[PDB]
Amino acid sequence: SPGIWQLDCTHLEGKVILVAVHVASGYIEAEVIPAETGQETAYFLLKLAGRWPVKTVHTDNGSNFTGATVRAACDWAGIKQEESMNKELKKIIGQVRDQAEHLKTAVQMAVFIHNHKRGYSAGERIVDIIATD
Amino acid sequence: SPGIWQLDCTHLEGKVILVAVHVASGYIEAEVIPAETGQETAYFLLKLAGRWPVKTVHTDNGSNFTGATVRAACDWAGIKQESMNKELKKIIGQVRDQAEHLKTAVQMAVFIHNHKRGYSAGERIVDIIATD
Ligand SMILES: CNCc1sc(-c2ccccc2)nc1C
Ligand SMILES: CNCc1sc(-c2ccccc2)nc1C
Numbered sequence: 001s002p003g004i005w006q007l008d009c010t011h012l013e014g015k016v017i018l019v020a021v022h023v024a025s026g027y028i029e030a031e032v033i034p035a036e037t038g039q040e041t042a043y044f045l046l047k048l049a050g051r052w053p054v055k056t057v058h059t060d061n062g063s064n065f066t067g068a069t070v071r072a073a074c075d076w077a078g079i080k081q082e083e084s085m086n087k088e089l090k091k092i093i094g095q096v097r098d099q100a101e102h103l104k105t106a107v108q109m110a111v112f113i114h115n116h117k118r119g120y121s122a123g124e125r126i127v128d129i130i131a132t133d
Numbered sequence: 134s135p136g137i138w139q140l141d142c143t144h145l146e147g148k149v150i151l152v153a154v155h156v157a158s159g160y161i162e163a164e165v166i167p168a169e170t171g172q173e174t175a176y177f178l179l180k181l182a183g184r185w186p187v188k189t190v191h192t193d194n195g196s197n198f199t200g201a202t203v204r205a206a207c208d209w210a211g212i213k214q215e216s217m218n219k220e221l222k223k224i225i226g227q228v229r230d231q232a233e234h235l236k237t238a239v240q241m242a243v244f245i246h247n248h249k250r251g252y253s254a255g256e257r258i259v260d261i262i263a264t265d
């Protein structure tokens with residue numbers, strides 16, 4: 001299941017963060033998004049699918065997935081819709097929050113640490129899994 | 134060499150796009166950024182370095198690289214400062230009419246560029262990096 005991702009939302013400081021986890025490796029892509037809307041969700045899914053070979057995304061199936069825009073983007077990219085990362089990830093953002101003005105910066109520092117931490121990191125694992133394929 | 138990227142800027146519709154190319158594979162990460170400033174450049178470099186093992190970035194060494202923020206982000210991430218780009222605007226040209234917003238058209242263009250195929254740029258970067 002090299003192509004399988006899980007997408008969840010998490011909230012901090014009145015802002016919305018989408019976190020996509022590659023299930024088999026635990027590698028994450030996460031970004032603060034303007035609002036939890038289908039348009040912004042579709043944008044995030046298109047970004048992810050351009051960077052890794054995404055076949056299926058497990059989502060929470062809420063409001064921002066019911067609309068025409070998200071359905072059209074998943075169709076176009078060839079994606080089918082069919083834990084406590086949020087916790088660990090918030091924990092690391094908690095550790096780094098004071099070093100960046102903006103939450104978004106702190107989010108990308110937390111992604112870096114999560115993906116690089118090692119006897120393989122999540123980044124080494126996703127590449128190995130996909131290379132094997 | 135697996136860890137080597139090139140970062141360039143390109144402009145379209147009064148907005149700024151940064152494009153990072155993994156030199157050995159031609160794989161691209163690109164996005165529209167709010168302004169070509171040290172703060173936004175630093176943000177884009179940290180994003181990239183969190184997602185791939187980035188050792189060296191070749192940049193154009195202009196104004197948005199001389200400041201304290203960018204130097205500190207490259208330090209923190211362990212990055213040193215030491216072709217596809219017209220292709221990219223071409224694809225964006227091909228898809229512009231299908232998304233309202235430029236940002237959307239950019240990510241569609243990245244997808245097509247990275248998946249287009251013996252191997253795509255996406256298959257090549259994973260193969261190269263997995264080899265080590
Ligand atoms: C599979 N072995 C090579 C890799 S891949 C890697 C990495 C990839 C993505 C994010 C973070 C680290 N670091 C190393 C040392
Ligand atoms: C190395 N072989 C497995 C891959 S990797 C891949 C891909 C990775 C990133 C962006 C686009 C495609 N497609 C496939 C079929």
Ligand SMILES: [Cl-]
Pocket residue numbers: 007008009036060064
């Ligand atoms: Cl969500």
Ligand SMILES: [Cl-]
Pocket residue numbers: 140141142169193197
């Ligand atoms: Cl630049």
